[PDB]
Amino acid sequence: MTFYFGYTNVELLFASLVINTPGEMVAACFGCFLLAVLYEGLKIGREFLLRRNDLEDNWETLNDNLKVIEAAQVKDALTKMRAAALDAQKATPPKSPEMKDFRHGFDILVGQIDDALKLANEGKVKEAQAAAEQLKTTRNAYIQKYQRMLSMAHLLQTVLHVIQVVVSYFLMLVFMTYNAYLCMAVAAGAGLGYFLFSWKKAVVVDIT
Amino acid sequence: MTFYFGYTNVELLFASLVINTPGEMVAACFGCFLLAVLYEGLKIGREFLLRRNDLEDNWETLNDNLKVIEAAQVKDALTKMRAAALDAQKATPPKSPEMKDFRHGFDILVGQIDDALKLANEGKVKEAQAAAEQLKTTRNAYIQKYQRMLSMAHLLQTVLHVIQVVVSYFLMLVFMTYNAYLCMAVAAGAGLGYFLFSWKKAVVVDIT
Amino acid sequence: MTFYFGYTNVELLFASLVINTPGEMVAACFGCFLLAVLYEGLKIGREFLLRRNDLEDNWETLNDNLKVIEAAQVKDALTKMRAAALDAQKATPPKSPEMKDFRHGFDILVGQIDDALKLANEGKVKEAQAAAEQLKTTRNAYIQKYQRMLSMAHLLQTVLHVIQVVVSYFLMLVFMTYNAYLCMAVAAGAGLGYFLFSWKKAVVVDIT
Ligand SMILES: [Zn+2]
Ligand SMILES: [Zn+2]
Ligand SMILES: [Zn+2]
């Protein structure tokens, strides 16, 4: 009826899956545990990829600052660009020739930025503005199109959200069986699954 | 029993709603799809309105900086105020005479700020402090009371959270029917519904 | 069957709990309301503690800036350290001799920072670098080990997430009974429970 302990005549989501022995029950419990882990890693993983897309900020920081520059306040705009250029260079698609091309474009960006600052530190204004207009040639050349990284990330995240929703309902359905062994397997799988993929995000860098 | 394909003797949440024909099933599937979309737009919409309340920051940034000013470090405090004043002016209640009054108060704020900076750039300190004390007369006049925008937003968001919770349980109950056509309708409605209201937040500005 | 109004032969999650009188029903409704509140406060409380761990930022801000310092750009690095040192001092473990020791170490940090700035404002560079190397002796002495605050917070949050997951399933199971009085009790408990613990986070400081 209602929170029972059993390994007999217990159906599990699908007509083919029924468990009538203890050895079947452990296999059912192991799967419902693993599904409960998989879910927690899915939700946390899906967030981590969403936060990494930060790129959208850096990308807007660069392009917003170019219009801000295009009157010796330019140096502060370019120092904001340099910072944004370096965090943007670290970026990588989720698990190399396009990357090596992308990364090496950003080196040229950061170098050009330093040269435009070198004019602003000496005091030269109009010339530092002319150099910044050349900067937008470089981002078009290397960085702009590869935007691919951002589109890939959004789709991947849509695909994951669907799977996250299916699994949630599936875990509701196994809990709804009212079998205390399955229910506990889910609960324990939620606890430990969260703890582990929580720990792996702490292994990767932690800011904000 | 357990993930069946059917359009016969299928009850849907309410005693009055039962579906015994395929033409009824499509109507049931269309409603459970739409409910699954509506939910995803509700959760995303409810977040977007919560992030927009940013205003709370700008409002505290202004008032925190006034006490910080009230010793030539004032210029940096007022430049923080100016930025905060302009993002605060963009704000608008969720879907005009009070607004036009509110917006036009902020113009006067930003202008007064520039005049207090003009003293600080020349080097004049005590006079730039006296001008800032007049700034708090202006926010009281126009901005302060209209705080209404913030209270409206919090209540709206409470109202939405309730509806978000009802719908979630309702979608659990339709999935719990174990009818594979309804279950799929929800799952598909979660996928596409998320994708669309995800896309509309990308249509609106994207920072942080 | 399907959204019924009743106080007769209604079972509630456990074989021992069955309700056959109206006076039992109110007790069931009060418990399912309270569980619905408790859940909302759990989710919001669990977030508030996660945001407070901010400390991780300040802690990395200090240690990142020390390597940045160890060429008169040091003053801006130390002013970032001072800010980070003061928000870090406000911190406290969730509900005093270790604290008084921890807080008083941070005073010494902020004072040492001011002295290193006093050299940078006069123009002295190499000496301001030598003072910063002494700063890392002080954090080791007082702050570093008490990291305990951070580890305590992560475990507490793991413990809460488990309980949050159990309660969610439990509230699904009471809603699944299809008793309109229990269902409403949950829905109302979600509405009001959210509103209150939403209001208490607004009582505590609100930034970002
Ligand atoms: Zn979770
Ligand atoms: Zn979703
Ligand atoms: Zn909620």
XYZ file of C-alpha atoms and ligand atoms in Angstrom:
627
model
C 0.000 0.000 0.000
C 1.864 2.860 1.492
C 5.616 2.784 2.162
C 6.054 -0.974 2.092
C 9.194 -3.073 2.286
C 9.181 -5.587 -0.548
C 10.891 -7.341 -3.434
C 7.742 -9.023 -4.796
C 5.382 -8.007 -7.610
C 7.007 -4.555 -7.769
C 6.633 -2.948 -11.193
C 9.129 -0.289 -12.305
C 7.835 2.253 -14.874
C 7.676 -0.158 -17.846
C 5.449 -3.207 -18.410
C 8.548 -5.361 -19.088
C 10.251 -4.291 -15.835
C 8.853 -6.135 -12.813
C 10.964 -7.390 -9.878
C 10.071 -10.581 -7.958
C 13.453 -11.489 -6.317
C 15.910 -9.707 -3.961
C 18.691 -9.910 -6.603
C 16.415 -8.054 -9.015
C 15.661 -5.512 -6.258
C 19.339 -4.583 -5.765
C 19.628 -4.073 -9.548
C 16.508 -1.867 -9.399
C 17.920 0.016 -6.390
C 21.325 0.479 -8.110
C 19.618 1.923 -11.209
C 17.353 4.249 -9.217
C 20.385 5.372 -7.188
C 22.409 6.002 -10.364
C 19.475 7.840 -11.952
C 19.250 10.043 -8.817
C 22.991 10.806 -9.098
C 22.881 11.350 -12.874
C 20.075 13.883 -12.302
C 22.006 15.946 -9.738
C 25.104 16.005 -11.978
C 22.839 16.987 -14.881
C 21.349 20.007 -13.035
C 24.765 21.166 -11.735
C 26.543 20.481 -15.031
C 23.804 22.343 -16.923
C 24.323 25.385 -14.636
C 28.154 25.350 -14.953
C 27.851 25.461 -18.772
C 25.252 28.273 -18.477
C 27.575 30.381 -16.247
C 30.518 29.834 -18.627
C 28.198 31.474 -21.186
C 30.754 35.400 -18.980
C 31.760 34.951 -22.657
C 28.618 36.849 -23.597
C 29.769 39.535 -21.115
C 33.378 39.721 -22.395
C 32.127 39.767 -25.976
C 29.772 42.670 -25.176
C 32.463 44.384 -23.025
C 34.825 44.543 -26.036
C 32.234 45.773 -28.533
C 30.635 48.199 -26.033
C 34.073 49.712 -25.248
C 34.962 50.204 -28.941
C 31.899 52.439 -29.386
C 32.747 54.127 -26.031
C 36.192 55.038 -27.455
C 35.003 55.947 -30.994
C 38.811 63.185 -24.321
C 41.514 61.104 -22.561
C 39.081 58.606 -20.925
C 39.954 56.029 -23.614
C 42.736 54.421 -21.511
C 40.180 53.208 -18.904
C 37.958 51.798 -21.696
C 40.913 49.876 -23.210
C 42.035 48.515 -19.801
C 38.508 47.124 -19.439
C 38.921 45.643 -22.955
C 42.262 44.002 -22.090
C 40.814 42.245 -19.029
C 37.801 41.110 -21.082
C 40.103 39.923 -23.914
C 42.134 37.636 -21.595
C 39.206 35.859 -19.832
C 37.653 35.453 -23.340
C 40.854 33.741 -24.577
C 40.721 31.105 -21.786
C 37.316 29.922 -23.117
C 36.907 26.485 -24.705
C 33.967 24.405 -26.111
C 32.541 21.665 -23.834
C 33.849 18.076 -24.260
C 41.683 22.231 -31.620
C 42.710 23.836 -34.993
C 39.852 26.382 -34.759
C 40.827 26.988 -31.108
C 44.520 27.586 -31.851
C 43.337 30.078 -34.518
C 40.837 31.678 -32.065
C 43.379 31.921 -29.185
C 46.087 33.387 -31.434
C 43.721 36.110 -32.692
C 43.237 37.202 -29.068
C 47.004 37.583 -28.534
C 47.026 40.051 -31.447
C 44.034 41.879 -29.839
C 45.754 42.221 -26.437
C 49.007 43.414 -28.068
C 47.216 46.038 -30.187
C 45.420 47.189 -26.994
C 48.756 47.682 -25.177
C 50.036 49.824 -28.084
C 46.884 52.002 -27.928
C 47.463 52.369 -24.143
C 51.132 53.326 -24.744
C 49.874 56.355 -26.713
C 47.347 57.261 -23.968
C 50.031 57.035 -21.216
C 52.317 59.401 -23.180
C 49.229 61.647 -23.625
C 48.479 61.163 -27.345
C 44.684 61.026 -27.836
C 43.601 61.088 -31.530
C 46.243 58.491 -32.494
C 45.068 56.104 -29.735
C 41.556 56.438 -31.259
C 42.879 55.551 -34.743
C 44.565 52.369 -33.411
C 41.315 51.235 -31.741
C 39.523 51.479 -35.121
C 42.037 48.910 -36.460
C 41.195 46.555 -33.506
C 37.769 45.751 -35.005
C 39.509 44.394 -38.145
C 41.234 41.767 -35.980
C 38.160 40.503 -34.079
C 36.344 40.084 -37.428
C 39.350 38.160 -38.789
C 39.690 35.641 -35.928
C 37.275 35.912 -33.013
C 33.818 37.110 -34.245
C 32.601 34.069 -36.202
C 33.993 31.553 -33.670
C 29.524 33.083 -31.709
C 29.685 29.462 -32.899
C 30.911 28.633 -29.350
C 27.875 30.495 -27.964
C 25.309 28.890 -30.293
C 26.698 25.393 -29.599
C 26.420 26.037 -25.856
C 22.771 27.198 -26.022
C 21.653 24.121 -28.021
C 23.612 21.691 -25.817
C 21.900 23.291 -22.815
C 18.435 22.943 -24.415
C 19.180 19.267 -25.125
C 20.278 18.758 -21.490
C 17.238 20.558 -20.005
C 14.886 18.140 -21.830
C 16.790 15.128 -20.502
C 16.811 16.758 -17.044
C 12.987 17.018 -17.189
C 12.467 13.410 -18.334
C 14.715 12.079 -15.535
C 12.897 14.166 -12.892
C 9.521 12.698 -13.828
C 11.093 9.241 -14.009
C 12.446 9.642 -10.453
C 8.970 10.843 -9.330
C 7.440 7.708 -10.865
C 9.885 5.360 -9.034
C 9.249 7.213 -5.738
C 5.509 7.008 -6.365
C 5.830 3.167 -6.303
C 5.939 3.601 -2.502
C 8.621 0.874 -2.232
C 10.814 2.030 0.668
C 13.945 0.383 -0.874
C 13.560 2.318 -4.168
C 12.566 5.532 -2.386
C 15.654 5.319 -0.183
C 17.829 4.505 -3.226
C 16.656 7.737 -4.879
C 17.018 9.826 -1.717
C 20.528 8.463 -1.103
C 21.376 8.942 -4.789
C 20.226 12.575 -4.584
C 22.349 13.178 -1.482
C 25.598 11.634 -2.707
C 25.143 12.606 -6.373
C 24.795 16.266 -5.378
C 27.789 16.047 -3.037
C 30.072 14.695 -5.791
C 29.193 17.048 -8.664
C 29.193 19.860 -6.068
C 32.789 18.772 -5.245
C 33.828 18.714 -8.980
C 32.699 22.331 -9.525
C 34.863 23.174 -6.465
C 37.759 21.352 -8.245
C 37.248 23.742 -11.205
C 37.867 27.494 -10.442
C 35.367 29.234 -8.045
C 34.486 32.944 -8.450
C 31.100 34.780 -8.257
C -1.043 -0.112 -16.208
C 2.368 1.274 -16.782
C 3.256 3.457 -19.778
C 0.338 2.484 -21.981
C -0.732 3.822 -25.352
C -4.418 4.688 -25.227
C -7.292 7.061 -25.892
C -9.889 5.110 -23.878
C -11.140 5.563 -20.308
C -8.302 8.016 -19.590
C -9.175 10.447 -16.803
C -7.409 13.821 -16.629
C -7.164 15.407 -13.141
C -10.875 16.293 -12.793
C -13.923 14.010 -12.524
C -15.570 15.842 -15.461
C -12.515 15.391 -17.718
C -12.328 11.885 -19.188
C -11.226 11.098 -22.768
C -12.687 8.155 -24.738
C -11.913 9.184 -28.385
C -8.737 10.069 -30.357
C -10.095 13.585 -31.094
C -10.434 14.144 -27.350
C -6.884 12.799 -26.885
C -5.327 15.393 -29.224
C -7.180 18.125 -27.285
C -5.815 16.626 -24.043
C -2.314 16.408 -25.558
C -2.502 20.024 -26.846
C -3.498 21.262 -23.371
C -0.799 19.258 -21.581
C 1.747 20.516 -24.131
C 0.607 24.128 -23.646
C 0.659 23.707 -19.860
C 4.249 22.377 -20.127
C 5.216 25.440 -22.212
C 3.337 27.900 -19.979
C 5.259 26.473 -17.000
C 8.706 26.958 -18.562
C 7.842 30.539 -19.587
C 6.523 31.103 -16.055
C 9.789 29.976 -14.378
C 11.976 31.968 -16.817
C 9.700 35.020 -16.775
C 9.613 34.933 -12.963
C 13.454 34.947 -12.898
C 13.788 37.813 -15.438
C 11.517 40.013 -13.272
C 13.519 39.000 -10.155
C 16.855 39.983 -11.803
C 15.410 43.329 -12.961
C 14.806 43.873 -9.224
C 19.584 45.674 -10.089
C 17.149 48.504 -9.198
C 17.610 47.557 -5.558
C 21.381 47.766 -6.215
C 21.271 51.154 -8.006
C 18.957 52.519 -5.330
C 21.371 51.395 -2.588
C 24.404 52.547 -4.657
C 23.046 56.127 -4.732
C 22.119 56.297 -1.047
C 25.301 54.479 0.076
C 27.458 56.931 -1.940
C 25.732 60.020 -0.475
C 26.768 58.940 3.038
C 30.244 58.044 1.646
C 30.591 61.660 0.413
C 28.985 63.347 3.469
C 39.241 64.416 1.214
C 39.071 64.482 -2.621
C 37.757 60.883 -3.016
C 34.238 62.257 -3.616
C 34.657 62.332 -7.433
C 34.919 58.496 -7.563
C 31.803 58.178 -5.348
C 29.809 60.511 -7.651
C 30.973 58.699 -10.828
C 29.595 55.516 -9.256
C 26.365 57.468 -8.560
C 26.088 58.691 -12.170
C 26.361 55.157 -13.581
C 23.793 53.923 -11.038
C 21.481 56.877 -11.851
C 21.391 56.052 -15.599
C 20.647 52.281 -15.341
C 17.979 53.231 -12.721
C 16.353 55.637 -15.225
C 15.963 52.882 -17.874
C 13.739 50.909 -15.439
C 10.030 50.398 -16.131
C 7.126 48.482 -14.447
C 6.157 45.104 -15.989
C 3.281 45.020 -18.537
C 3.202 56.540 -18.224
C 2.561 59.919 -16.442
C 4.281 58.669 -13.251
C 7.109 57.297 -15.435
C 7.660 60.555 -17.341
C 7.821 62.261 -13.908
C 10.199 59.550 -12.555
C 12.501 59.627 -15.638
C 12.676 63.435 -15.662
C 13.701 63.519 -11.982
C 16.682 61.313 -12.882
C 17.848 63.753 -15.586
C 18.015 66.447 -12.886
C 19.988 63.998 -10.652
C 22.565 63.209 -13.369
C 22.980 66.919 -14.220
C 23.489 67.905 -10.567
C 26.066 65.071 -10.305
C 28.034 66.451 -13.286
C 28.133 69.907 -11.636
C 29.475 68.370 -8.390
C 32.140 66.554 -10.486
C 33.054 69.833 -12.262
C 34.048 71.241 -8.847
C 36.055 68.086 -7.977
C 37.934 68.176 -11.337
C 38.925 71.830 -10.744
C 39.966 70.735 -7.208
C 37.224 72.350 -5.086
C 36.270 69.951 -2.258
C 33.924 71.509 0.366
C 31.690 73.043 -2.339
C 31.325 69.666 -4.114
C 30.156 68.272 -0.730
C 27.541 71.050 -0.381
C 26.103 70.282 -3.857
C 25.759 66.570 -2.996
C 23.642 67.502 0.061
C 21.185 69.189 -2.353
C 21.012 65.935 -4.442
C 18.980 64.184 -1.715
C 16.266 66.875 -2.070
C 15.773 65.813 -5.702
C 15.492 62.035 -5.146
C 12.872 62.697 -2.428
C 10.977 64.969 -4.844
C 10.790 62.543 -7.797
C 12.420 59.137 -7.417
C 12.111 57.904 -3.772
C 8.370 57.196 -3.512
C 8.139 55.713 -7.036
C 9.878 51.904 -4.099
C 6.348 51.481 -5.481
C 8.028 49.843 -8.528
C 9.885 47.512 -6.135
C 6.848 46.597 -4.010
C 4.734 45.908 -7.124
C 7.467 43.614 -8.457
C 7.747 41.572 -5.226
C 3.966 40.947 -5.033
C 3.686 40.094 -8.747
C 6.509 37.594 -8.217
C 4.766 36.039 -5.180
C 1.569 35.708 -7.237
C 3.532 34.038 -10.072
C 5.401 31.622 -7.758
C 2.063 30.258 -6.450
C 0.788 29.705 -9.989
C 4.162 28.146 -10.884
C 3.725 25.650 -8.004
C 0.133 24.728 -8.927
C 1.115 24.093 -12.573
C 4.086 21.914 -11.542
C 1.882 19.615 -9.471
C -0.704 19.611 -12.257
C 1.961 18.490 -14.763
C 3.078 15.781 -12.272
C -0.525 14.560 -12.052
C -0.898 14.308 -15.878
C 2.457 12.467 -16.118
C 1.377 10.166 -13.296
C -1.544 9.000 -15.526
C 1.116 6.868 -17.267
C -0.467 7.617 -20.679
C 2.512 7.758 -23.059
C 0.742 10.328 -25.329
C 0.203 12.786 -22.429
C 3.653 12.115 -20.966
C 5.268 12.834 -24.329
C 3.101 15.960 -24.757
C 4.458 17.304 -21.455
C 8.061 16.329 -22.204
C 7.874 17.924 -25.664
C 6.137 20.976 -24.181
C 8.936 21.323 -21.610
C 11.595 21.094 -24.326
C 10.114 23.586 -26.783
C 8.586 25.888 -24.144
C 12.002 26.315 -22.514
C 13.682 26.879 -25.883
C 11.286 29.712 -26.807
C 11.257 31.710 -23.555
C 15.030 31.088 -23.399
C 15.197 32.711 -26.881
C 13.039 35.738 -25.783
C 15.374 36.559 -22.864
C 18.201 36.470 -25.463
C 16.115 38.963 -27.541
C 16.116 41.285 -24.485
C 19.603 42.566 -23.368
C 22.055 39.939 -21.916
C 24.584 40.880 -19.191
C 25.648 39.036 -15.975
C -11.104 9.186 -7.487
C -9.875 12.418 -8.875
C -9.855 15.670 -6.886
C -12.374 14.654 -4.251
C -13.525 16.470 -1.141
C -13.305 14.117 1.820
C -12.267 13.354 5.380
C -12.948 9.598 5.193
C -10.610 6.663 4.528
C -7.847 9.068 3.448
C -4.382 7.582 3.924
C -1.382 9.898 4.337
C 2.007 8.461 3.249
C 2.375 5.959 6.127
C 0.313 2.854 6.951
C -0.273 4.171 10.503
C -1.553 7.552 9.256
C -5.159 7.362 8.053
C -7.785 10.081 8.655
C -11.491 9.245 9.142
C -12.786 12.415 10.941
C -12.830 16.175 10.154
C -10.723 16.920 13.278
C -8.066 14.554 11.943
C -8.323 16.277 8.538
C -7.487 19.734 9.944
C -4.442 18.194 11.682
C -3.453 16.608 8.346
C -4.035 19.922 6.538
C -2.015 21.864 9.169
C 0.915 19.445 8.776
C 0.824 19.516 4.969
C 0.630 23.326 5.101
C 3.584 23.498 7.514
C 5.557 21.034 5.382
C 4.874 23.245 2.320
C 6.145 26.296 4.254
C 9.151 24.460 5.724
C 10.119 23.452 2.166
C 10.049 27.006 0.781
C 12.104 28.299 3.735
C 14.495 25.380 3.194
C 15.102 26.227 -0.502
C 15.498 29.975 0.203
C 17.581 29.431 3.343
C 19.811 26.971 1.466
C 20.417 29.624 -1.245
C 21.167 32.445 1.257
C 23.872 30.284 2.900
C 25.259 29.393 -0.569
C 25.511 33.099 -1.578
C 27.217 33.984 1.728
C 29.820 31.432 0.574
C 31.395 35.947 -1.412
C 33.797 34.686 1.304
C 35.329 32.414 -1.314
C 35.640 35.536 -3.517
C 37.187 37.765 -0.809
C 39.543 34.962 0.183
C 40.675 34.554 -3.445
C 40.760 38.368 -3.947
C 43.318 38.724 -1.119
C 45.551 35.846 -2.214
C 45.270 36.736 -5.932
C 46.277 40.361 -5.178
C 49.332 39.331 -3.110
C 50.766 37.493 -6.134
C 49.723 40.476 -8.334
C 51.855 42.758 -6.106
C 54.794 40.329 -5.633
C 55.745 49.286 -11.136
C 53.448 51.573 -9.079
C 50.204 49.631 -9.814
C 50.406 48.024 -6.349
C 48.211 50.715 -4.708
C 45.170 49.629 -6.798
C 45.814 45.960 -5.883
C 45.954 46.816 -2.145
C 42.780 48.966 -2.313
C 41.043 45.904 -3.767
C 42.525 43.898 -0.850
C 41.254 46.378 1.766
C 37.674 46.200 0.459
C 37.880 42.389 0.357
C 39.363 42.315 3.896
C 36.433 44.290 5.396
C 33.533 42.281 3.850
C 35.478 39.120 4.903
C 35.607 40.385 8.520
C 31.791 40.788 8.692
C 31.401 37.023 8.024
C 30.047 34.677 10.699
C 29.149 30.923 10.908
C 25.432 30.013 10.615
C 23.407 29.553 13.849
C 32.594 33.360 19.671
C 36.225 32.994 20.972
C 37.431 31.775 17.541
C 35.442 34.629 15.943
C 36.914 37.346 18.179
C 40.353 35.927 17.239
C 39.397 35.796 13.510
C 37.920 39.350 13.471
C 40.910 40.828 15.318
C 43.354 39.289 12.817
C 41.514 41.159 10.046
C 41.952 44.513 11.827
C 45.720 43.902 11.754
C 45.444 43.033 8.006
C 43.552 46.247 7.147
C 45.998 48.373 9.187
C 49.057 46.807 7.524
C 47.371 47.450 4.135
C 46.928 51.166 4.948
C 50.645 51.427 5.837
C 51.605 49.809 2.496
C 49.299 52.337 0.739
C 50.919 55.235 2.667
C 54.234 54.305 1.001
C 52.584 54.058 -2.457
C 50.889 57.493 -2.056
C 54.249 59.105 -1.165
C 55.687 57.251 -4.212
C 57.840 54.582 -2.518
C 57.540 51.313 -4.489
C 60.010 48.589 -3.350
C 59.248 49.245 0.344
C 55.478 48.904 -0.255
C 56.270 45.491 -1.835
C 58.277 44.423 1.248
C 55.361 45.305 3.585
C 52.930 43.223 1.491
C 55.206 40.170 1.932
C 54.707 40.543 5.716
C 50.871 40.574 5.202
C 50.861 36.840 4.369
C 52.358 36.109 7.826
C 49.255 37.647 9.429
C 46.596 35.774 7.407
C 48.382 32.484 8.229
C 48.421 33.459 11.922
C 44.707 34.308 12.273
C 42.509 34.013 9.193
C 43.709 31.098 6.965
C 42.773 28.069 9.088
C 39.443 29.574 10.237
C 38.496 27.625 5.605
C 36.817 25.864 8.542
C 33.932 28.356 8.038
C 33.827 27.349 4.352
C 33.962 23.581 4.950
C 31.229 23.792 7.621
C 29.022 25.726 5.193
C 29.424 23.195 2.342
C 28.506 20.209 4.569
C 25.547 22.020 6.171
C 24.321 22.786 2.649
C 24.694 19.132 1.560
C 22.726 18.055 4.647
C 19.985 20.603 3.823
C 19.768 19.623 0.125
C 19.012 15.993 1.108
C 16.250 17.105 3.474
C 14.976 19.473 0.756
C 14.706 16.500 -1.651
C 12.907 14.233 0.844
C 10.342 16.962 1.643
C 9.692 17.634 -2.067
C 8.831 13.995 -2.737
C 6.765 13.914 0.453
C 4.754 16.942 -0.742
C 4.307 15.223 -4.153
C 2.965 12.134 -2.370
C 0.394 14.161 -0.339
C -0.706 16.010 -3.512
C -0.951 12.691 -5.341
C -3.637 11.620 -2.790
C -5.975 13.813 -4.882
C -7.686 15.089 -1.696
C -8.587 18.702 -2.525
C -8.210 19.778 1.161
C -4.607 18.465 1.362
C -3.747 19.735 -2.122
C -4.990 23.208 -1.212
C -3.118 23.058 2.123
C 0.132 22.429 0.225
C -0.565 25.074 -2.424
C -1.442 27.654 0.246
C 1.593 26.591 2.293
C 3.828 27.076 -0.763
C 2.387 30.544 -1.391
C 2.632 31.911 2.145
C 5.811 30.013 3.087
C 7.627 31.542 0.108
C 6.269 35.010 0.896
C 7.578 34.903 4.487
C 11.107 33.567 3.920
C 11.261 35.892 0.884
C 10.444 38.744 3.331
C 13.165 37.617 5.851
C 15.914 37.727 3.191
C 14.678 41.289 2.459
C 15.066 41.998 6.230
C 18.734 40.918 5.906
C 20.918 43.116 3.571
C 20.098 43.005 -0.215
C 22.851 43.414 -2.853
C 23.512 41.512 -6.142
Zn 19.103 19.022 -6.114
Zn 12.889 23.758 -16.751
Zn 9.249 27.682 -4.689
